[PDB]
Design an enzyme around this catalytic site. Structure first.
Site, PDB file in Angstrom:
ATOM      1  N   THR A 116       0.850  -1.226   0.000  1.00  9.00           N
ATOM      2  CA  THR A 116       0.000   0.000   0.000  1.00  9.00           C
ATOM      3  C   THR A 116       0.867   1.250   0.000  1.00  9.00           C
ATOM      4  O   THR A 116       1.769   1.387   0.827  1.00  9.00           O
ATOM      5  CB  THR A 116      -0.937   0.044   1.226  1.00  9.00           C
ATOM      6  OG1 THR A 116      -1.893  -1.022   1.142  1.00  9.00           O
ATOM      7  CG2 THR A 116      -1.678   1.392   1.317  1.00  9.00           C
ATOM      8  N   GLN A 117       0.594   2.156  -0.934  1.00  9.42           N
ATOM      9  CA  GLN A 117       1.267   3.446  -0.972  1.00  9.42           C
ATOM     10  C   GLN A 117       0.264   4.538  -1.324  1.00  9.42           C
ATOM     11  O   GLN A 117      -0.944   4.301  -1.382  1.00  9.42           O
ATOM     12  CB  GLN A 117       2.430   3.464  -1.987  1.00  9.42           C
ATOM     13  CG  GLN A 117       2.857   2.124  -2.570  1.00  9.42           C
ATOM     14  CD  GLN A 117       2.006   1.713  -3.760  1.00  9.42           C
ATOM     15  OE1 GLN A 117       0.779   1.793  -3.715  1.00  9.42           O
ATOM     16  NE2 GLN A 117       2.654   1.269  -4.830  1.00  9.42           N
ATOM     17  N   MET A 138      -1.464  -6.616  -2.284  1.00  7.36           N
ATOM     18  CA  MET A 138      -1.703  -5.356  -1.565  1.00  7.36           C
ATOM     19  C   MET A 138      -0.612  -4.313  -1.812  1.00  7.36           C
ATOM     20  O   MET A 138      -0.341  -3.468  -0.958  1.00  7.36           O
ATOM     21  CB  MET A 138      -1.872  -5.617  -0.060  1.00  7.36           C
ATOM     22  CG  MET A 138      -3.089  -6.461   0.276  1.00  7.36           C
ATOM     23  SD  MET A 138      -4.626  -5.629  -0.168  1.00  7.36           S
ATOM     24  CE  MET A 138      -4.721  -4.385   1.119  1.00  7.36           C
TER      25      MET A 138
END
Ligand SMILES: *[B]([O])([O])[C]([C][C]([C])[C])[N]C(=O)[C]([C]C1=[C][C]=[C][C]=[C]1)[N]C(=O)C1=[C]N=[C][C]=N1
Ligand SMILES: *[B]([O])([O])[C]([C][C]([C])[C])[N]C(=O)[C]([C]C1=[C][C]=[C][C]=[C]1)[N]C(=O)C1=[C]N=[C][C]=N1
Ligand SMILES: *[B]([O])([O])[C]([C][C]([C])[C])[N]C(=O)[C]([C]C1=[C][C]=[C][C]=[C]1)[N]C(=O)C1=[C]N=[C][C]=N1
Ligand SMILES: *[B]([O])([O])[C]([C][C]([C])[C])[N]C(=O)[C]([C]C1=[C][C]=[C][C]=[C]1)[N]C(=O)C1=[C]N=[C][C]=N1
Ligand SMILES: [Cl-]
Ligand SMILES: [Cl-]
Ligand SMILES: [Mg+2]
Ligand SMILES: [Mg+2]
Ligand SMILES: [Mg+2]
Ligand SMILES: [Mg+2]
Lengths: 204, 195, 196, 233, 222, 212, 226, 195, 196
Positions: free
Chosen positions: D1-2, D107
């Site tokens: 996740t970013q 993810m």
């Protein structure tokens, strides 16, 4: 938690040839627990009929409130309130509680005594008027009722045919909703006679 | 508090209400009477948040007693129940609402009929042959659905009530220390001292 | 932080302030943000001091090992090694780096590597918190193929304004000139650049 | 996740009788800052495919390198690399679509919305979309971001269904695309005047147009607009 | 924070006849208040006289259909080109779904075909793999609008025979393929009117002993 | 959901409802909440749909493998413990199960094990599981005896589910009955609640509160 | 919701779609979004439907009293000022997004209003979930010195863009034309491009299909004489 | 689960453990034996989170039974208690810890002494004359502090235990459906079938 | 938003872009941010459109009533009325306003009122999201006692850069000239100012 689906219930209304019909289930619950099978959601003030779904305390409170207001109306005006006028009164009354609203889904049905024109209308919890030609739906199985009415309905149905259509719309919608059922009532309304029919349905 | 039951038979209304009062960890009392006489032929049982219950019940009692003196007349159970509902329906949108559920059992001397009303803290009123508040109905309604018939005698009503209490004492986790039972009929209100 | 690199006729010049802050406290007022990863490939650092030092140390190692095997690396190659670290570790890094270098074949080149880890080859580049205040000035005043003296003035005036307006920038203006002639370090003190 | 840092806005495209057109502006935004003004966001693959990318630019540059590597790899031990066994638009898309869905499933997504435009071996028009979630769909017109809300309505007036494709010439299609780019410049706060356009035709091949500008803009009516209601001066 | 799921809307409907089966679905694909495509096929022929649709999140939907089609291929390789029966396909799909029990395929899956006695069959799945053979099933956005109508018009629920007044039920007479298609078309026309994510087009796949046939009908595009 | 099972003179009665719900929406009224693990073993389903389906079919595979290896019918104790040990491995991960593993062997006799997704494994005579469990318990506890005929035991189970179906909003549809003897279980039909309610009301004189 | 407003030579035109929605469900298929503030001042509303109705009625009522008090026909700027100040006071909580148009003794006018109380002036405007689809059409085809016929065409085309491309909009196009020195013409259902096709089957039931428990006559009449 | 008690007298250890098992709203069982025999002269009662309790108890039981077979020798109560403590002390820093509290009552045949060990889920061990887990000690320890004397007979120990259970049945809110009592002495382990 | 006011020899000039945004959508591309509270007292508005309109309407009312009682108000007076509203309602307002006006006694004056509600009298003032990018440029290029033509060029060039770099700024450049001669409105279109 969600006030509009604690007690459960549904109302549906339809127009026909020189007639209108309004129907409701009889369930009152506390979420999963069924409490009463005799909780009627349709009331009438003169010849104007009002169905109310949603939070039951507010259903009762509003019925008492509109009985109050339509009684004063009649004393001052010296005539019974008409469906079109009553619709505006419901809208006004709901909107005055804009930021502390009654958690309800009202439905008006009736025939104008002077013009003889069939009339139905629906509202959101805060007064917006939906004045449909064909039908109005309300309650926890409104999605189901929309699906039934949209397919089953055709215009200009005779009173005894309209009965079958609205009854089948309610029954089959209620059977796909956990918080609706436990009995049902249908009102067939003509210009100067009103018939009330209780329907036999599954009690689960 | 915990369990309050009600049943309406042929010629009377019977209310059963638990005796326990628990403050968190300990049971402070095992003989508490969770009811108030509103008028000679009208009884109200109650259960909800601590303090609010008695405060509300006594407030209603005072109001009905005031009406009785002013008019020299007893209000009908239906009239009393409507007054109580309105007070709760007013309460729910207050700054701090009454967290109280009630059962109103009364004998209407005009119609010669017993009447049982169930009202929750929201102001939700229903007339019933038998009723309950909280988790009490979850255990008892299946038995009442099977056995209740509307022409029962008062003795038959008490037996069906014993069967309900026995089921509660078997399947409920909490020890509610038994129930105080009271009967409302044409002769007024009396307590069954052995149950 | 106010950092910039500018290409010109003879090569490229890197410029930077000297302020390191922990909130509003100036932890170091004489910091050297112009760092050497190869003889004539340097970089300007902004963001986390730890991250940008860790990255610069790894890059210097990679280019030292590259040199031993394949001879002098290009500036583009150096930028790619910076990118590879910044992109692949974007979730754990806070580093805004400008890479500047001088080849003989390619002459002066500037690559900017913002937070994401993307690469952008440009004629000149600005970065750091203080760069926001000089986008207008730098865009209006930059020309290609400037002289050494003109480019020094352009950087000196630009960073002067960045320092004036940005609390996170200050101290001395450090510069590093990269040309065929070699490597020249310059320093400019507050009394000089504040009166500009 | 970013989170996306340096971003590219709308990519728009449509089909016409003999091929497909695709376009995207040359801006790389850093939040509200219009940081980088010379960013090419259409990336050709061979002479039969153009991949248009929006969203995170660092992830775009990664995808650009994957495609460059894909061409190299296809040529290995392949005598027909420039003929029958050349990379098709459908091959390039499916590869990207696989990567996008795999990355979202770990993810750790490539924060992009991608449109692959091209012409197949048999002359058939290819136009399909894929994004960070691995969601895919095809349509006579396709657009990303703001283009979806503003460009599609205009482009759908030219080609509303499949049967409108043979009736649409390259001149009419390009005109519609260029107009849509102007509308986006009026109304998208993260767009630029400069853009690139690419046409892939089954007859005339790949035409790649750089350094285009939005022109014929209406601003004169602004002089008459005063205050916000009651003000006259 | 990154959200790995999305909602592509759409609605699907499976009905099992006496010697046939239909699987229908609208062709509209959406996100939020935008239309992605007016014609994006959602119901697929998977071979062995089996049709499938995975409605909800299209990325997971495509992935699942792709993996099942793959499973059919390898079933042929591993078991001497044996025909994969509809009941076997159903059980296989449960294991595909449950394999991702703790990171689910966000879809409502329905397959249709013929059982080993030649009778019509429909199976329905939830996202985490629970399944059940059914005569009738709608899935997706407008499922709540369609199912009650099918309870009434396919299974004759709450319908009784005139004159008897509630004593004798309406007999459950079998429906032809022409009669079912009529009910499918009316179901989607009605759903299109009252559900914003339903419209554009309707694609029906009909399965008989002769094979798989397709029919397409226009829906309202607003 | 309402599921029950109880031991008596004639073996075990198992009775379940048929309803499945997503929020207030009734998803299905035709759910098979009894799993036929083999000709001798039954499992009930309550909680989340798939978990109980998937793992109780799986349980049947393990039982089949046991009796292939050991040349002997698996005990109810061993079968129930395979399931409970499996779910205990998944404890915390979010499985949702409440089930009764029911069987009849020579060494044990009629046996019921309550198995639970928190790892609980309890042997017992009477169990009710689900959102309508309290309603079903009432009818059972007051009418249960050991010396019940197979006919009367079947009716009690049917009646107890009906009680819950009526009151519990998340229970209903239809009733599935099973009778478990030593030679195996025996299915005793699907009973629609819509028809069963009116029938029982009329014949039994119960539900006087409801109008018919 | 898609609502637009377009200025032209001798007046102004406003238009709107007729769809109302509760989540993903259509509550009303033929909703009326064009409201009358006064005979020649009309506005279109997006957002919360009860609010756009209520705030229009209130200001429309006060505008009528103001017109009687001053013996003058009402002005659009008066309606604008009264609406913005009301909405600002309620800090955005009254969710009314309005396009206010009309003709008065000063001339023809066109304004927009947002829920927080900010107003904007323009020759062409659009509001609602389909405003981007509509604005695309407006930006492509709008010019100075439009005729009446051209402005109606442009306005309805902008609504159509919303109807077809936006899921929050649909059904029909309502129009209201306000020309200087003329009565305002309200064109209800100006376009009807979404009539439902005939159903395959009739679902009229045989009489006696539904099971009944009880019948009774309801007394709607008053207490009778004698 | 709920209440587990333990008392060490002159020549034996007595463990008392509730019979109720509650799954939220209903009491699923009223005859549950919350104990396992680890060896002929060592008994362990337990209470904690559902599933974990039995899983842990049986795991310990298996390990002690394995030791007994391997060495043909019964471990001392002290040795068994230390093994159990270490398992819980290991458990508390695991991915998912055993949420189980135990009492270990044993008769040491070498020293001819009864021994009672109290261990919580953290691995906190104490040797005691009398012990309890959860809220049980809050009601019972005041009675045990008064009456306990260490030369008590087993019959005196049971009487003092009855007094404890009576206090619990009076002041605890939960109905724990009585207790199963077991005695550990030189002759082994036996259950008191009438209590 | 990019707004500025600049005093010069003959008086003062206000300048502004025309872009109003709802996120990334440009809700109005031809907005008028230069608003009139009195004949020769105007203001530039930034922040919430609703708030700044509500404030400007109230101020115009106050100054209209002031004029009827005490004659023409000073620019300082107008700034004080703005301040009183912005300061006392700081918790509920998002408004960054520049007040500019021309007296004959005091000539051209500029007051800037940032978020807090403080007042700052300045020779020139810049504000809005786009002002950040032109602090450097404006500081380097501002002189006191410029001519009308020079001041128009200074504002045109400044806002051009602010528009170039800020996504929240764009459209036309509006200006309002305040001198003894009267009130003059100016407009400059993209084709003109983009090529600067
Ligand atoms: B500059 O301000 O970005 C500067 C560049 C650094 C390489 C010396 N960074 C810092 O001063 C940072 C804080 C910071 C300020 C502004 C933007 C981003 C980060 N300081 C540190 O990392 C630091 C502070 N105190 C001790 C050690 N490191
Ligand atoms: B029963 O009500 O527990 C039932 C048993 C299941 C095996 C069919 N469960 C459900 O119907 C649950 C809802 C529920 C209601 C009451 C208690 C616990 C659970 N349904 C679902 O979990 C579900 C999930 N997705 C789609 C449909 N239903
Ligand atoms: B449009 O999408 O802005 C439209 C305009 C309205 C004036 C008819 N809005 C609606 O239809 C709104 C959308 C909405 C949903 C939920 C909260 C707020 C707004 N719908 C309603 O106001 C509505 C919904 N159901 C019944 C009555 N009104
Ligand atoms: B400018 O960008 O600050 C501008 C000035 C305003 C007076 C027209 N403000 C806006 O565009 C604001 C958003 C905003 C952007 C940047 C900083 C602060 C605020 N817009 C609105 O207030 C707005 C947007 N859409 C509709 C109505 N009002
Ligand atoms: Cl450093
Ligand atoms: Cl404004
Ligand atoms: Mg400084
Ligand atoms: Mg639409
Ligand atoms: Mg039920
Ligand atoms: Mg301890």
């Amino acid at each position: 938690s969600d006030p509009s689906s604690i007690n459960g219930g549904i109302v549906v209304a339809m127009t026909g040839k020189d007639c209108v019909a309004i129907a409701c289930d009889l369930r009152l619950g506390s979420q999963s627990l069924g409490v009463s099978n005799k909780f009627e959601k349709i009331f009438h003030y003169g010849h104007v009929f009002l169905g109310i779904t949603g939070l039951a305390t507010d259903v009762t409170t509003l019925n008492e409130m509109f009985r109050y207001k339509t009684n004063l109306y009649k004393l001052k005006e010296e005539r019974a309130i008409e469906p079109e006028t009553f619709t505006q009164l419901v809208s006004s009354s709901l909107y005055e509680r804009r930021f502390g609203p009654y958690f309800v889904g009202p439905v008006v049905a009736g025939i104008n005594s002077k013009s003889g024109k069939p009339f139905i209308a629906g509202f959101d919890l805060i007064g917006c008027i939906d004045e449909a030609k064909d039908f109005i739906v309300s309650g926890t199985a409104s999605d189901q009722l929309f699906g039934m009415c949209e397919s089953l309905y055709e215009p200009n149905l005779e009173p005894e045919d309209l009965f079958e259509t609205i009854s089948q719309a309610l029954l089959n919608a209620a059977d796909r909703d956990a918080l609706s059922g436990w009995g049902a009532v249908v009102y067939i309304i003509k210009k100067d006679e009103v018939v009330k029919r209780y329907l036999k349905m599954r009690q689960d | 508090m915990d369990i309050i039951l009600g049943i309406r038979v042929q010629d009377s209304v019977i209310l059963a209400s638990s005796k326990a009062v628990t403050r968190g960890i300990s049971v402070l009392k095992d003989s508490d009477d969770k009811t108030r006489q509103l008028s000679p032929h009208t009884l109200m049982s109650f259960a909800g948040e601590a303090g609010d219950t008695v405060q509300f019940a006594e407030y209603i009692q005072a109001n009905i007693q005031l009406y009785s003196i002013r008019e020299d007349y007893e209000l009908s159970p239906q009239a009393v129940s409507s007054f109580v509902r309105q007070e709760l329906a007013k309460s729910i949108r207050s700054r701090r609402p009454y967290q109280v559920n009630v059962l109103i059992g009364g004998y209407d001397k005009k119609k010669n009929k017993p009447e049982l009303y169930q009202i929750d803290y929201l102001g939700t009123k229903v007339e019933l042959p038998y009723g309950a508040h909280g988790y009490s109905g979850f255990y008892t309604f299946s038995l009442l659905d099977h056995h209740y018939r509307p022409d029962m005698t008062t003795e038959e009503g008490l037996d069906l009530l014993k069967l309900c209490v026995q089921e509660l004492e078997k399947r409920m986790p909490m020890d509610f220390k038994g129930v105080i039972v009271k009967i409302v009929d044409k002769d007024g209100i009396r307590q069954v001292d052995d149950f | 932080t106010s950092i910039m690199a500018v290409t010109f006729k003879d090569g490229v010049i890197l410029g930077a302030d000297s302020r390191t802050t922990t909130g509003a406290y100036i932890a170091n007022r004489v910091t050297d943000k112009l760092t050497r990863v190869h003889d004539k490939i340097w970089c300007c650092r902004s963001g986390s001091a730890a991250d940008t030092q860790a990255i610069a140390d790894i890059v210097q190692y990679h280019l030292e090992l590259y040199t031993s095997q394949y001879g002098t690396p290009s500036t583009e190659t150096a930028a790619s090694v910076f990118k590879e670290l910044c992109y692949e570790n974007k979730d754990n890094l806070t580093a805004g780096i400008i890479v500047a270098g001088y080849d003989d074949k390619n002459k002066g080149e500037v690559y900017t590597i913002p937070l994401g880890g993307s690469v952008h080859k440009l004629p000149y580049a600005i970065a750091g918190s203080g760069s926001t205040f000089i986008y207008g000035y730098c865009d209006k005043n930059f020309r290609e193929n400037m002289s050494k003296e003109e480019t020094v003035d352009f950087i000196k005036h630009s960073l002067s304004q960045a320092i004036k307006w940005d609390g996170s920038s200050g101290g001395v203006i450090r510069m590093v000139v990269l040309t065929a002639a070699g490597v020249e370090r310059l320093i400019f003190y507050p009394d000089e650049y504040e009166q500009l | 996740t970013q989170q996306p840092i340096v971003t590219g806005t709308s990519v728009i495209s449509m089909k016409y009788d003999n091929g497909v057109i695709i376009a995207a502006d040359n801006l790389g935004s850093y939040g509200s800052l219009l940081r980088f003004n010379g960013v090419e966001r259409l990336i050709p693959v061979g002479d039969n495919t153009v991949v248009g990318i929006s969203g995170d630019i660092s992830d775009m540059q990664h995808i650009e390198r994957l495609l460059k590597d894909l061409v190299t790899e296809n040529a290995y031990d392949n005598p027909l690399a420039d003929a029958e066994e050349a990379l098709e638009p459908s091959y390039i898309f499916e590869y990207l679509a696989t990567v996008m869905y795999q990355r979202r499933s770990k993810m750790n997504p490539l924060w992009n919305a991608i449109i692959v435009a091209g012409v197949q071996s048999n002359g058939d028009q290819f136009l399909r979309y894929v994004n960070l979630l691995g969601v895919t769909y095809s349509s006579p017109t396709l657009a990303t971001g703001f283009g979806a809300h503003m460009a599609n309505p205009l482009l759908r007036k030219v080609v509303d269904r499949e049967s409108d494709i043979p009736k649409t010439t390259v001149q009419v299609a390009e005109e519609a695309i260029v107009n849509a780019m102007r509308v986006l410049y009026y109304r998208d706060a993260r767009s630029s005047r400069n853009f690139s356009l690419a046409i892939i035709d089954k007859n005339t091949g790949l035409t790649f147009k750089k350094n285009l500008q939005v022109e014929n803009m209406k601003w004169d009516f602004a002089k008459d607009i005063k205050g916000y209601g009651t003000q006259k001066i | 924070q990154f959200n790995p799921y999305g909602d592509n809307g759409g609605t699907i409907l499976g009905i099992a006849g006496e010697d046939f089966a239909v699987l229908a679905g609208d062709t509209r694909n959406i996100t939020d208040y935008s239309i992605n495509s007016r014609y994006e096929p959602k119901v697929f022929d998977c071979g062995d006289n089996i049709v499938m649709s995975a409605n909800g999140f299209a990325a997971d939907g495509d992935a699942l259909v792709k993996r099942f089609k793959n499973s059919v291929k390898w079933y042929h390789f591993d078991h001497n080109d044996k025909k994969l029966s509809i009941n076997s396909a159903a059980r296989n799909i449960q294991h595909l779904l449950y394999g991702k029990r703790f990171f689910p395929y966000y879809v409502h899956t329905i397959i249709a075909g013929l059982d080993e006695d030649g009778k019509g069959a429909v199976y329905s799945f939830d996202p985490v793999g629970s399944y059940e053979r059914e005569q009738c099933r709608a899935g997706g956005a407008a499922a709540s609008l369609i199912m009650p109508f099918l309870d009434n018009q396919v299974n004759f629920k709450n319908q009784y025979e005139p004159g008897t007044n509630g004593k004798v039920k309406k007999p459950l007479k079998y429906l032809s393929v022409e009669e079912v298609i009529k009910l499918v078309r009316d179901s989607f026309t009605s759903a299109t009117e009252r559900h914003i994510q339903v419209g554009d087009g309707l694609e029906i796949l009909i399965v008989t002993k002769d094979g798989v046939r397709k029919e397409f009908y226009e829906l309202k595009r607003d | 959901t309402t599921t029950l099972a109880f031991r008596f003179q004639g073996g075990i009665i198992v009775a379940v409802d048929s309803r499945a719900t997503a929020g207030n929406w009734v998803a299905s009224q035709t759910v098979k909440k009894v799993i036929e693990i083999n000709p001798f073993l039954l499992g009930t389903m309550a909680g989340g749909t798939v978990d109980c389906q998937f793992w109780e079919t799986w349980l049947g595979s393990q039982c089949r493998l046991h009796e292939l290896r050991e040349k002997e019918r698996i005990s109810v104790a061993a079968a129930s413990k395979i399931l409970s040990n499996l779910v205990y491995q998944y404890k915390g991960a979010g499985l949702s199960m409440g089930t009764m593993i029911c069987g009849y062997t020579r060494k044990e006799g009629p046996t019921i094990y309550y198995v639970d997704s928190d790892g609980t494994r309890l042997k017992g005579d009477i169990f009710c599981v689900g959102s309508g469990q309290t309603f079903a318990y009432g009818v059972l506890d007051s009418n249960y005896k050991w010396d019940l005929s197979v006919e009367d035991a079947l009716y009690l189970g049917k009646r107890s589910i009906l009680a819950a179906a009526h009151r519990d909003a998340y229970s209903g549809g239809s009733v599935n009955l099973y009778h478990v003897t030593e030679d195996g279980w025996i299915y005793h039909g699907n009973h629609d609640v819509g028809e069963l309610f009116w029938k029982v009301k009329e014949e039994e004189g119960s539900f006087n509160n409801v109008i018919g | 919701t898609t609502i637009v407003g377009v200025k032209f030579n001798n007046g102004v035109v406003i238009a709107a779609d007729t769809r109302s929605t509760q989540g993903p469900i259509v509550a009303d298929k033929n909703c009326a979004k064009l409201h009358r503030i006064s005979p020649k001042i009309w506005c279109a509303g997006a957002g919360t439907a009860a609010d756009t109705e209520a705030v229009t009625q209130l200001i429309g009522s006060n505008i009528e009293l103001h017109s009687l008090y001053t013996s003058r026909e009402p002005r659009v700027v008066s309606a604008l000022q009264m609406l913005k100040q009301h909405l600002f006071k309620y800090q955005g909580h009254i969710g009314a997004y309005l396009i206010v148009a009309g003709v008065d003794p000063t001339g023809s006018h066109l304004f927009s209003i947002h829920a927080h109380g900010s107003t904007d002036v323009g020759y062409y405007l659009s509001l609602g979930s389909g405003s981007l689809a509509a604005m695309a059409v407006l930006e492509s085809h709008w010019k100075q010195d439009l005729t009446k016929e051209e402005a109606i065409k442009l306005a309805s085309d902008a609504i159509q863009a919303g109807i077809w491309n936006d899921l929050g909009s649909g059904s029909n196009v309502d129009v209201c034309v306000m020309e200087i020195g003329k009565d305002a013409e309200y064109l209800r259902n100006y376009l009807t491009p979404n009539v439902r096709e005939e159903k395959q089957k009739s679902y009229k039931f045989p009489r006696g299909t539904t099971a009944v428990l009880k019948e009774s006559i309801v007394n709607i009449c008053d207490i009778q004489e004698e």
